[PDB]
């Protein structure tokens, strides 16, 4: 019963060292370690985390190692350090996620019982994508199809804390991006908002041909999933939004009404005093 | 200078700058500032008091 | 020998460490082990701090059981990568930044076993704003008294990086120690995908203000610059009519000018053209 | 850098901050103001602080570091 997540931006920076303290004699080309949180009430949160040495053959993928001796000294290290914070799970790198991730999960649900995976991005980094998780449960399928494990899906975001959110600012000093915009990061925050837009929605076709071609095999569980989408639009007919929209279309026309009278009055003001300026110091320096 | 006050620095205890403006706090009771509130003629009898 | 160039190079996981431990204890002084790698006599980095548990006080701190350090070194050479320490670290909340009775002794200790080691102090209840006072300083030895300190200027860099306060040069500047300067080693694949991650958005852009506190935050906008033309009235126009001295208290303690009454106007111009607009483009996208 | 400096202005004074009174003012931003933990100081104020709202001992503001007339 998970609602979110809340990655503090501590770990991931971890990760990126962890994804460099192996890339330089290692090509296992994919980050394994332990993830520590702090369960509250209902929202997770993750403050800490470490790595542990983890490979993985391609040859029959299904062969492991995990160091469960350096698991057992370094969290009970933290806990002698700090006695708050305590194991929420584990995390991976890389997109395309191996199938020992069921024999990783299983294993180390002796350790928490609401075990969670966060898969981060060092590489896919470009578009607007942000770190996932999944969940561990265990159902059979749907109803009359087989067994399988079908890794459901945690919505995730990003909380920082007092610290470590001013912190953040004095590392960046290069654009630092303002609070409310003056027309030009609004205007951007609809651009970009655009971008992510159409790119799901080639992705949602791209999915779709693939089916309705027929390679892989259906799930009913995104038909009606997309279903809905569709006759949930609204459609805008009559009585119901040509008279509300202009309702407040033209009311919010009136309020800038006065930007047009004020400022116009405010540079006209500024040109008689220069003008008076000028014509006095013209007429006095000769 | 008499009752004269410093600007005086905080960690190290070094003068900054003489201070103006003599000493006199809580003056809000003191310097009235109005003069108009009541004229000459208005007691009367007591002219010798005066 | 000693140099005036020598540049830090902290992480930026580094310095998340440093805040994080030193908020988590504020009363208490936290003191922590700062593991980094010299690359040549005079530029040092650190990329990754751990900690130490602590049983210390609210003006001094001490340590644990040393058996705990020599066994976390051995554990983290074999996940990532080994290296060998290069100073030390702690939490001044309540001053600023200089170096107390036993911090020096701590010094003394760990540049005779060790290289160089210098030393940071962070503040952690003022970085708050927006701004930081993590500085870190070195100990110089005391026999060289008669020539210079922190001598042969190789560079001219080292005057606008580091300008100590009157605070600071009160306590052990010069005569002791010296300060040493910082800078950020920021690099791809970690910044931008810093940014990409925290101030990023997708449905904010396309979101309507819900009308119900958007126009009627409006109509406390335009009473108040409402009162503002009231004010603004009589104001210039009586100045300029009795006494044309374009100075005396309407120029030295003011505040009514033409800067007040057009960033009403600009605030309400941002807040609703991006408003008008954002509900110009779901009538076409939404059917 | 101007919309910088209108924001740095901003964040200094939607703090936790204590509450002194107004004693005296020296000249243009500069004043003298006391704190009710005695010990009388000695600060700057801002140009935004409006100087026609100074003349009693007023209900002011200060910083807990800089302990300006915020």
């Given at each position: 019963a998970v609602q979110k997540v809340v990655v503090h931006p501590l770990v991931l920076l971890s990760v990126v060292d962890h994804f460099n303290r192996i890339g330089k004699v290692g090509n296992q080309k994919r980050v394994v370690g332990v993830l520590l949180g702090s369960w509250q009430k209902k929202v997770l949160d993750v403050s800490n985390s470490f790595a542990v040495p983890f490979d993985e053959d391609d040859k029959d993928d299904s062969v492991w190692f995990l160091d469960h001796d350096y698991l057992e000294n370094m969290y009970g290290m933290f806990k002698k350090v700090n006695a708050r914070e305590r194991i929420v799970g584990w995390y991976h790198t890389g997109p395309k996620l191996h199938k020992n991730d069921i024999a990783?999960?299983?294993?180390?649900?002796?350790?928490?019982?609401?075990?969670?995976l966060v898969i981060i991005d060092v590489k896919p980094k470009d578009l607007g994508l942000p770190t996932e998780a999944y969940i561990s449960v265990e159902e059979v399928h749907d109803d009359g199809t087989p067994t399988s494990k079908t890794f459901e899906h945690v919505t995730s975001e990003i909380g920082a804390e007092e610290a470590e959110e001013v912190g953040v600012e004095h590392l960046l000093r290069d654009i630092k991006d303002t609070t409310v915009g003056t027309l030009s990061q609004r205007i951007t925050?609809?651009?970009?908002?655009?971008?992510?837009?159409?790119?799901?929605?080639?992705?949602?076709?791209?999915?779709?041909?693939?089916?309705?071609?027929?390679?892989?095999?259906?799930?009913?569980?995104?038909?009606?999933?997309?279903?809905?989408?569709?006759?949930?639009?609204?459609?805008?007919?009559?009585?119901?939004?040509?008279?509300?929209?202009?309702?407040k279309t033209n009311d919010q026309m009136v309020v800038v009404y006065l930007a047009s009278l004020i400022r116009s009055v405010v540079a006209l003001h500024n040109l008689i005093n220069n003008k008076i300026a000028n014509r006095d110091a013209e007429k006095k320096e000769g | 200078?008499?009752?004269?006050?410093?600007?005086?620095?905080?960690?190290?205890?070094?003068?900054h700058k003489i201070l103006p403006n003599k000493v006199d706090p809580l003056v809000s009771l003191m310097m009235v500032e109005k003069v108009p509130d009541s004229t000459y003629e208005m007691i009367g009898g007591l002219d010798k008091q005066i | 020998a000693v140099d005036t160039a020598e540049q830090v190079y902290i992480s930026s996981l580094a310095l998340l460490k440093m805040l994080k431990?030193?908020?988590?204890?504020?009363?208490?002084?936290?003191?922590?082990?700062?593991?980094?790698?010299?690359?040549?006599?005079?530029?040092?980095?650190?990329?990754?701090?751990?900690?130490?548990?602590?049983?210390?006080?609210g003006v001094s701190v001490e340590a644990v059981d040393p058996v705990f350090q020599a066994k976390m070194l051995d554990m983290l050479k074999q996940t990532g990568r080994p290296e060998m320490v290069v100073g030390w670290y702690h939490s001044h909340p309540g001053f600023g930044?200089?170096?107390?009775?036993?911090?020096?002794?701590?010094?003394?200790?760990?540049?005779?076993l060790s290289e160089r080691a210098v030393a940071v102090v962070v503040d952690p209840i003022q970085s708050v704003k927006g701004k930081v006072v993590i500085d870190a300083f070195r100990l110089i030895n005391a026999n060289m008294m008669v020539l210079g300190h922190e001598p042969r200027q190789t560079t001219s860099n080292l005057g606008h990086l580091n300008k100590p306060s009157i605070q600071a040069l009160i306590h052990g500047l010069n005569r002791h120690y010296?300060?040493?300067?910082?800078?950020?080693?920021?690099?791809?694949?970690?910044?931008?995908?810093?940014?990409?991650?925290?101030?990023?958005?997708?449905?904010?852009?396309?979101?309507?203000?819900?009308?119900?506190?958007?126009?009627?935050?409006?109509?406390?906008?335009?009473?108040?610059?409402?009162?503002?033309?009231?004010?603004?009235?009589?104001?210039?126009?009586?100045?300029?009519?009795?006494?044309?001295?374009?100075?005396?208290?309407?120029?030295?303690?003011?505040?009514?000018?033409?800067?007040?009454l057009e960033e009403h106007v600009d605030v309400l111009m941002t807040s609703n053209i991006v408003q008008c607009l954002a509900a110009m483009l779901d009538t076409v996208v939404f059917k | 850098?101007?919309?910088?400096?209108?924001?740095?202005?901003?964040?200094?004074?939607?703090?936790?901050?204590?509450?002194?009174?107004?004693?005296?003012?020296?000249?243009?931003?500069?004043?003298?103001?006391?704190?009710?933990?005695?010990?009388?100081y000695y600060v700057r104020i801002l140009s935004t602080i409006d100087r026609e709202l100074l003349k009693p001992n007023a209900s002011v503001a200060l910083h807990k570091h800089s302990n300006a007339l915020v």
């Open positions: 990783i999960n299983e294993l180390m649900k002796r350790y928490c019982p609401n075990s969670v925050n609809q651009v970009h908002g655009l971008k992510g837009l159409n790119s799901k929605l080639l992705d949602i076709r791209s999915y779709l041909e693939k089916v309705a071609t027929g390679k892989l095999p259906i799930n009913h569980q995104i038909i009606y999933q997309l279903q809905d989408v569709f006759n949930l639009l609204p459609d805008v007919s009559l009585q119901e939004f040509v008279k509300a929209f202009y309702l | 200078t008499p009752n004269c006050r410093v600007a005086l620095r905080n960690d190290s205890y070094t003068l | 431990h030193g908020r988590a204890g504020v009363p208490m002084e936290v003191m922590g082990l700062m593991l980094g790698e010299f690359v040549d006599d005079y530029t040092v980095r650190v990329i990754d701090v751990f900690a130490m548990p602590q049983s210390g006080t930044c200089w170096l107390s009775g036993v911090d020096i002794n701590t010094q003394q200790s760990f540049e005779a010296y300060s040493i300067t910082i800078n950020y080693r920021k690099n791809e694949l970690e910044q931008k995908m810093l940014l990409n991650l925290h101030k990023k958005s997708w449905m904010e852009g396309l979101t309507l203000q819900d009308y119900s506190e958007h126009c009627k935050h409006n109509e406390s906008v335009v009473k108040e610059m409402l009162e503002l033309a009231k004010n603004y009235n009589k104001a210039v126009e009586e100045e300029d009519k009795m006494t044309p001295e374009q100075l005396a208290i309407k120029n030295v303690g003011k505040q009514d000018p033409k800067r007040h | 850098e101007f919309l910088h400096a209108q924001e740095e202005v901003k964040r200094i004074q939607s703090i936790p901050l204590v509450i002194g009174q107004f004693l005296e003012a020296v000249d243009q931003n500069t004043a003298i103001v006391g704190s009710t933990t005695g010990s009388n």
